[PDB]
Amino acid sequence: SATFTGVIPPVMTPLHADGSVDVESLRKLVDHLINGGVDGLFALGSSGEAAFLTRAQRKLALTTIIEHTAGRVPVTAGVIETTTARVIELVEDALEAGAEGLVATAPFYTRTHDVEIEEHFRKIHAAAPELPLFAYNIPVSVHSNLNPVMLLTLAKDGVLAGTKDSSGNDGAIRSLIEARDDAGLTEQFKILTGSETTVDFAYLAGADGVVPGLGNVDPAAYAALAKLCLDGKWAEAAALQKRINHLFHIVFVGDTSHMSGSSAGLGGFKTALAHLGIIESNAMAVPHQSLSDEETARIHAIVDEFLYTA
Amino acid sequence: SATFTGVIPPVMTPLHADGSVDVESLRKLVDHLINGGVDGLFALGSSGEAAFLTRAQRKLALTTIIEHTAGRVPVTAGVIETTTARVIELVEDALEAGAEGLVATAPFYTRTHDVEIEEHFRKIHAAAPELPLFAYNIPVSVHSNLNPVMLLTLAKDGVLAGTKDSSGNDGAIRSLIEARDDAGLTEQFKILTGSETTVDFAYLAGADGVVPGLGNVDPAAYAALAKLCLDGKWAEAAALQKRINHLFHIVFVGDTSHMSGSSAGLGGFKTALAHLGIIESNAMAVPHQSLSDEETARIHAIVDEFLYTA
Amino acid sequence: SATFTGVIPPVMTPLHADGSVDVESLRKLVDHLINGGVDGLFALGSSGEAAFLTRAQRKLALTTIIEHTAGRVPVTAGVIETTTARVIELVEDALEAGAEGLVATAPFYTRTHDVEIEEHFRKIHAAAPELPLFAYNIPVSVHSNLNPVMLLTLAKDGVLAGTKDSSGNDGAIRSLIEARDDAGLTEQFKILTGSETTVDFAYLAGADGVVPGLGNVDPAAYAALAKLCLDGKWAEAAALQKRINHLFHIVFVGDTSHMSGSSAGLGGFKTALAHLGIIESNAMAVPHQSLSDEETARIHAIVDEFLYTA
Amino acid sequence: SATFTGVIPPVMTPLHADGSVDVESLRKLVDHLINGGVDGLFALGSSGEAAFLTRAQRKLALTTIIEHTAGRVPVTAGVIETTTARVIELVEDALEAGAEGLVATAPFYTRTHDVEIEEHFRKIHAAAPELPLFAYNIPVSVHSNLNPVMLLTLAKDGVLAGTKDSSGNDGAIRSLIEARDDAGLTEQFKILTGSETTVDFAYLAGADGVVPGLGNVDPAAYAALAKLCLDGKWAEAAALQKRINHLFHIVFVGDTSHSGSSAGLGGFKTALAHLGIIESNAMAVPHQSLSDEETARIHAIVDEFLYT
């Protein structure tokens, strides 16, 4: 059974202009990440535009990633959907594709409750009991916060193998790590931060890895950062993290007075990837807004200056 | 070309204990509503547990409703999904089933923006330009508020035929009606309230109809209320609305210390329907919680006292 | 003791350019309101810029209002402050000035809880047990919602004489009225809406009165509206409310891309009052932003068109 | 002019049973903090129950603190109030008492706007231009977030001397520090975290200090933590922060089913009474009291995790 620790980017989905999955570019991106030093891949996560792809498109992207990865690193599959029956359909797809782990959120659109969230995860686990199931804490998208007491209960019960926490709340992540360790659940329950700019903080508190969207652009930077942290080189880690945080400025280029943070952020990532020659274009799924030729030039300049070298 | 005004309940989905669609009970429910005097049916809305049903189950419920209705009243179809491509798949299902209208929300899960919401509705309309498209304002579930200026812009362009507003903000609904009328868009853009307890207010302000979940339980009450409002009998309407609001107490019976508002509310509705002999049981989709015997007895008592009598 | 029902505007505070209270204009405003047919005055409410006035300035405004009113209508006094001891200081001021009622909010700035909100109101009441104490529900400013069950508990105990509800949620106001009536607390606990645009709705549901900011500008319109409602002329009431709602557009003139809603809204009211010759100028307390000549011209045109004629 | 960096706790206000300021306990607390190694004191902040104290009580508490401090460390004064004119009254009080700095928030209760927030701070500055003015970012209480571009504009203009950030968002604080340094405003604009449990993170990112409520209870722990961070001993710092974070469990003892202020500040005062620094854990109205069982639990946490 695969173990999901270390640097595990949420793989993006390159697209053609007509919105279909750009399989050739997706293969190039997978190679970019693996040869960049990542420890695993998270397919069909938020930054993979999972919420934008149809079920059929998700299946194609997942299969493309798993087949091209060819066992080099483990691949975990997102099963993001509103409620349990719909998530379990995606679990079946994931098993069919040979996924080595699952990533699920709380229910959304519907009102929910900690009791119902817990049942949700238990029933997802039961659909694929041999796969490590990670709980994806992402309040900006699902509008629930995953109760840390519930998570540790499910860890103890063997229902959850870990969590990917994208709440942006490092104090809360730290508290969860401390609670986990005090409960003696350190080895059983992996804690991955979704942070792109406070990865050194997470490792200093004893987190097990990172799922950074920006890791699509600069996988080598995050690999190098994790290595510094694991070697206890905290000052050096902080200096590298600061440079990564200046690369991160690509997500702030797009004018959010007329587009969402997804358009600006994921668009900035894809723009960088196209500039680096990894994918064919920065095409986005509907209804994402395009970046202007001026915005893309600014993104290029940032990439040129702050992409990691060593 | 079908016109969606008047009392248009969001039809529930009766279920078997194994979670499958209870087709026989769904047919009985359809007759209950139509014989109760409603003016149309909204299939695959929030109260139909659309977020809980798989795409295949949605297709079964929609087809069951349309075929049993047999043209007695028009049927509009929810196409609720996270983003545009996924919504358009459901539009395709709706056309295949012979739906006579469409109901869509803003994008959700993903971050969004008014610019992206507008593009979303335009693209949905383009997928079925001959069907009336209604915008469904439901901030509690999608966590965007539909910009009323954008809605009227889309109405003027023929993209939107109306809106179903479940925001619970009657001042905002009133302001939108006023702006519509001042823009000369009164006939082009129907405004339906999703309110169950302030339907008289909406009609007094010139709304075109109502989409009340409780209308599943007591369609005759809402038909009677609409008629009083249409006849300008506002005092009589307020007295009936007050009685309806005491029937509505069935949604507050379930103890929300261990269940969601959906479990308590929709569970309350289904418990009432089962008590009235319209559907086989109050089975809910996973991960809804069950109501206790004490809770169902309280629901029965409320139904007995406050169900409509002329 | 005085009874606070009917039309009770939150009296504004006219200012000199240096920010001091314009006593002469405040007297003219009091006459404008009373001769406009109002049933009471609410001094030192939100629309009175209570949050902007020093304790000394509040005392001056309050005393000016009470003395010029000369017993023509009852005056209730805001005691808006963060927590209980600070509120009780203002209760002492109100007693000194001869106020005939008190209006208090939940605690704010500090984190709070329903248990603490309840204690807060009990302690305020204990400082002036012979004055009617109204609870001011204004979540946009205090970021708590007053629990309706708590409110009725305090009503039964004789702690609260009523509530002024500015939540903008007419469904919730209606539910509270229904709960009050079902508990047999109709006479004991007055329910006043802070709505400016859905006053007819509130009266239809059996509210006792209205505290409308726009009532400063057009007291006669709200007096006329209340009378129509009390006479059961609901269609005529709705028509008049619609005209009032177009007068209300004065609050939307100010460019909120460079001011607050308070600058645009209260500024709009003061601009209208200056236009009507009631107050010297539209001077606002720091840090409100000023309205442009273009904006004031637009406000003047709206006032000319939609002001009520008795 | 005073420099507000390092460990600067928001001094609590001990009370008598009737809610009046307990000046003898307040003096003992001030000594507790100063002898515990803090670098400054923040009087009349949120943890000082400033929102609960009347203007007259704030004056008494501030005077008591400044006089007992007797120049040993600098004292900055909170001037927390809804809007500008009311804040400036408090600025006048602060000058009268001899405060050496000011801490202000955005306007609250009233709706506001970045334009009005900026005018607010400029006018507060003009009322006492020789005092360092720190902007207090505390969205949980004022329900505005201070715009970091605005803060740096004000820093460049000499209106703001710094910020105390209690948003709990370490990524956002880090971004502000980076933006400050990139704009060449490092020396002019001090950035202090209000975090109690991620102080080492803040120092790793180059923050100038910390304003921790729990620092009332264990000033020596935070003084030791800051020293480790300044010495670049990050592994040792993280280990000490972890211990501090277990002491912090005292704020989670109170049953919040019947506020966080009651549980949290009540937890602190319970610890201070247990340590003999203040007379009792009396809280301002309408705070709820902690039960015997709850105070016993707080005592046990203090006994185990207090820094030695």
Task: Collect all residues with Cβ–Cβ distance below 8 Å to A144 and sequence separation of at least 6.
Answer: A106, A107, A108, A112, A117
CA distance D131 to D112: 25
Rounded to an integer, what distance in angstroms lies between the CA atom of residue C47 and that of residue C244? Answer: 18
DSSP state of B129: T
Q: What's the rounded Cα separation, in Å, for the pair B77 and B42?
A: 6
Residues in chain B: 310
Give buried/exposed letters for C39-63 (b at 16+ CB in 10 A, else e).
bbbbbbbbbbbbbbbbeebbbbbbb
Report how many helices (DSSP H) and strands (DSSP E) chain B contains, helices first: 12, 8
Structure tokens at D246: 């277990």
Per the CB < 8 A criterion, the answer to whether A181 and A206 are in contact is: yes
Sign of CA dihedral A304, A305, A306, A310: positive
DSSP D110: S
Nearest to A193 by CA among A206, A184, A183, A202: A202
* CA–CA separation, A300 and D190 (whole Å): 33
Per the document, the length of chain D is 308
Catalytic residue among B28, B59, B164, B190: B164
Residues of B in Cβ contact (< 8 Å) with C170 = 170-171, 198, 201
| C-A interface (Cβ pairs under 8 Å ≥ 3) | no
Q: Given an 8 Å threshold on Cβ–Cβ distance, is C117 in contact with D286?
A: yes
Of D84, D259, D260, the CB nearest to C287: D84
Residues of chain D with Cβ-Cβ distance to C84 below 8 Å are 52, 284-286
- Which one from C59, C123, C156, C164 is the annotated catalytic residue? C164
Give domain limits for chain D.
1-308
Token pair in block for residue D52: 């609960």
The DSSP secondary-structure symbol of B288 reads P
Binding-site residues of A for pyruvate, in ranges, read 46-47, 211
**DSSP bridge pairs for D6:** D209
Maximum distance among all alpha carbons in chain A?
53
Identity of residue D149 = V
Identify each DSSP E strand in chain B by its residue range: 6-7, 41-43, 75-78, 101-104, 133-137, 162-165, 190-193, 209-210
Taking the mean position of all CA atoms in its chain, how far away is CA A275? 22
Q: Of the candidates D19, D141, D143, which has its C-beta nearest C110's C-beta?
A: D141
- Give the residue on C whose Cα is nearest the Cα of B242: C178
CB A173 within 8 A of CB A191: yes
Q: For chain B, say whether C246 makes contact (Cβ under 8 Å).
A: yes
B135: helix, strand or coil: strand
Q: In what order do the strands lie in the sheet with C162-165?
A: C6-7, C209-210, C190-193, C162-165, C133-137, C101-104, C75-78, C41-43
Q: How many angstroms separate the CA atoms of B143 and D3, rounded?
A: 44
Helix A170-182 × helix D170-182 angle, to 10° = 130
Residue type, D16: H
Beta strands C133-137 and B209-210: pairing type? Answer: unpaired
Interface contact A305, partner D, CB < 8 A: no
Q: Say how far apart CA A288 and CA A309 lie, in whole Å.
A: 32
Cβ atoms of A292 and A284 within 8 Å: the answer is: no
CA dist D12 and C307 (Å) reads: 54
The Cα D115–Cα D276 span in angstroms is 47
| C195 marked among binding-site residues | no
Which superfamily, per CATH, for D1-308? Aldolase class I (3.20.20.70)
Cβ–Cβ gap C108/D107 under 8 Å: no
Which residues, 6 or more positions from D60, have their beta carbon under 8 angstroms from its beta carbon? D21, D23
Query: Residues D135, D122: contact at Cβ < 8 Å?
Result: no
Chain C: residue whose CA lies nearest to B246: C178
- Decide if B287 and A120 are in contact by the 8 Å CB cutoff: yes
Distance from CA of B236 to the nearest CA of A (A): 34
| Peptide bond preceding C287 in cis form (omega within 30 of 0) | yes
Residues in CB range of A252: below 8 A, 6 or more apart: A264, A268
What is the Cα–Cα distance from A252 to A266, expressed in whole angstroms? 11
DSSP H/E element including D164: strand D162-165
| Cβ–Cβ under 8 Å, residues B165 and B173 | yes
Q: Which two tokens stand for residue A92?
A: 């079946």
Q: For residue A82, what is the nearest residue in chain B, using CA coordinates? A: B51
Q: Which residues of A40-79 are buried (b: 16+ CB within 10 A; e: fewer)?
A: bbbbbbbbbbbbbbbeebbbbbbbbbbebbeeebbbbbbb
Grouping H, G, I as helix, E, B as strand and the rest as coil, residue D217 is coil
Say which DSSP state B24 is in: H
CA C151, C155, C157: angle at the middle one, nearest 5? 120
CB count within 10 Å of CB B266 equals: 28
Residue B259's contacts (CB-CB under 8 Å, 6 or more residues apart) are A113, A115, A116, B267, B288, B289
Chains in touch with D (3+ beta-carbon pairs under 8 Å) read: A, C
- Give resolution in angstroms: 1.6
- Within 8 A of C197 by CB-CB distance, chain B residues are 171, 174-175
Mutation choice for B interface testing from C198, C214, C248, C302 by most B CBs within 10 A: C198
Dihedral of CA D201/A179/C111/A165: which sign? Answer: positive
Within 13 A of C299's CA, how many CA atoms are on the CB side? Answer: 27
Contact A288, A262 (CB under 8 A): yes
Residues in CB range of C100: below 8 A, 6 or more apart? C1, C2, C74, C75, C76, C131, C132
Which of C1, C12, C2 minimizes the C-alpha distance to C212? C12
CB nearest to B169's CB, from C168, C204, C232: C168
How are strands ordered across the β-sheet holding B41-43?
Answer: B6-7, B209-210, B190-193, B162-165, B133-137, B101-104, B75-78, B41-43
Cβ of A110 within 8 Å of Cβ of B52? The answer is yes
Question: Is there a contact between B52 and A123 if contact means CB atoms under 8 Å apart?
Answer: no
Whose CA is closest to A225, among A265, A197, A186? A197
Q: Identify whether the C-beta of residue C7 lies closer than 8 Å to the C-beta of residue C29.
A: no
Q: What letter represents residue C147's amino acid? A: N
Chain B CB within 8 Å of residue C233 CB: no
From the CA of A239, how many Å to the nearest CA of chain B?
31
CA separation for the pair C269, D288 (Å, rounded): 41
CA distance B150 to B128: 20
Nearest to C38 by CA among C208, C276, C167, C216: C216
Q: Calculate ∠ Cα A97-A100-A105, nearest 5°.
A: 95
Largest Cα separation within chain C, whole Å, is 53
The DSSP bridge pattern shows strands C209-210 and C190-193 to be parallel
Give the pair of three-digit tokens for residue C199: 């006053």
- Widest Cα–Cα separation across chain D: 53
Report how far apart, in Å, the C-alpha atoms of B133 and of each of A285, B102, B213 are. Answer: 22, 5, 20
CA-CA distance, A119 to D140, in Å (whole number)?
Answer: 32
Print the SS3 string covering D17-41.
CCCCECHHHHHHHHHHHHHCCCCCE
Cα–Cα distances in Å, from C63 out to B264, B283, C21, C39, C81?
52, 64, 12, 19, 19
Dig out the tokens for D229 from the structure: 């961070």
Indicate yes or no: CB of A116 within 8 angstroms of CB of B288. Answer: yes
State the best of C166, C173, C174, C243 to mutate against chain B, taking most chain B CBs within 10 Å: C174
The amino acid present at B216, given as its one-letter code, is N
Please tell me the CATH superfamily of domain B1-310, with its number. Answer: Aldolase class I (3.20.20.70)
Q: List the strands of the sheet with D133-137, edge to edge.
A: D6-7, D209-210, D190-193, D162-165, D133-137, D101-104, D75-78, D41-43
Q: Which of A178, A198, A235 sits opposite D174 (nearest CB)?
A: A198
What are the distances in angstroms from CA C5 to CA B40, C2, C99, C129, C146?
A: 42, 10, 16, 19, 20
CB contact under 8 A, A204 and D200: yes
- C-beta of residue B211 within 8 angstroms of C-beta of residue B42: yes
- Cα–Cα distance between A152 and A182 in angstroms, integer? 11
Work out whether strand C75-78 and strand C101-104 pair parallel, antiparallel, or are unpaired.
parallel
Nearest to D245 among A178, A200, A234 (CB): A178
Decide if C175 touches B, using CB distance below 8 A.
yes
Within 8 A of D238 by CB-CB distance, chain A residues are 204-205
User: Under a CB-based contact definition with an 8 Å cutoff, are residues D131 and D104 in contact?
Assistant: no
Neighbouring chains to C with at least 3 Cβ pairs closer than 8 Å:
B, D
Furthest C-alpha separation in chain B: 53
- Among candidates C175, C201, C245 on the partner chain, residue whose Cβ is nearest the Cβ of B201: C201
**What's the token pair of residue A86?**
């719909």
Chain A hits for B258, Cβ within 8 Å: 113, 115
Instruction: Report residue D170 as tokens.
Output: 């370490």
Compute the distance between CA of residue D7 and CA of residue D5 in angstroms, rounded to an integer.
7
**Can you tell me the distance from the alpha carbon of A197 to that of B1, in angstroms, rounded to the nearest whole number?**
53
Q: What are phi and psi of C136, to 5 degrees?
A: -100, 105
Structure tokens at B104: 């869509």
Q: Is the bond into A287 cis (omega within 30 degrees of 0)?
A: yes
* C69-to-B12, C128, C171 alpha-carbon distances in Å: 58, 22, 35
B162 strand-pairing partners: B134, B190
Nearest CA in chain B to A56: B86
- Gap from C269 CA to chain B (nearest CA, Å): 19
Say if the Cβ atoms of A238 and D168 lie within 8 Å.
Answer: no
The whole-angstrom separation of Cα C114 and Cα C120 is 10
Q: Is D22 exposed, middle or buried (0-12, 13-18, 19+ CB in 10 A)?
A: buried
Q: Quick one: which of A309, A247, A302 has its CA closest to A36?
A: A309
- Beta-carbon contacts of C212 under 8 Å, excluding residues fewer than 6 positions away, are C7, C9, C10, C194, C195, C196, C199, C222
Of B46, B110, B289, the CB nearest to A115: B289
User: Under 8 Å CB-to-CB from B239, ≥6 apart: which residues?
Assistant: none
What is the residue type of B231? D
C81 Rama class: left (phi>0) / alpha (psi -120 to 50) / beta = beta
Chain A neighbours, 3+ Cβ pairs < 8 A: B, D
Residue A99, Cβ neighbours under 10 Å: how many?
A: 27
Read off the tokens for B46.
Answer: 């929030």
Gap between the Cα atoms of B60 and B19, Å rounded: 13
Q: Say which residues have a Cβ less than 8 Å from residue B97's Cβ, sequence separation at least 6.
A: B59, B62, B63, B66, B77
Residue count (chain C): 310
Instruction: Measure in Å the smallest separation between the Cα of C113 and chain D Cα atoms.
Output: 5
SS3 letters across chain C: CCCCCEECCECCCCECCCCCECHHHHHHHHHHHHHCCCCCEEECCHHHCCCCCCHHHHHHHHHHHHHHHCCCCCEEEECCCCCHHHHHHHHHHHHHHCCCEEEECCCCCCCCCHHHHHHHHHHHHHHCCCCCEEEEECHHHHCCCCCHHHHHHHHHCCCCCEEEECCCCHHHHHHHHHHHHHCCCCCCCEEEECCCCCHHHHHHCCCCEECCHHHHCCHHHHHHHHHHHHCCCHHHHHHHHHHHHHHHHHHHCCCCCCCCHHHHHHHHHHHHHHHCCCCCCCCCCCCCCCCCHHHHHHHHHHHHHHCCCC
Asked if A168 is an interface residue toward chain D (Cβ–Cβ < 8 A), one would say: yes
Q: Is D197's CB within 8 Å of A175's CB?
A: yes
Q: Which method resolved this structure?
A: X-ray
What chains are in contact with B, requiring at least 3 Cβ pairs below 8 Å?
Answer: A, C
Which residues of A are less than 8 Å from D246 in CB distance?
178
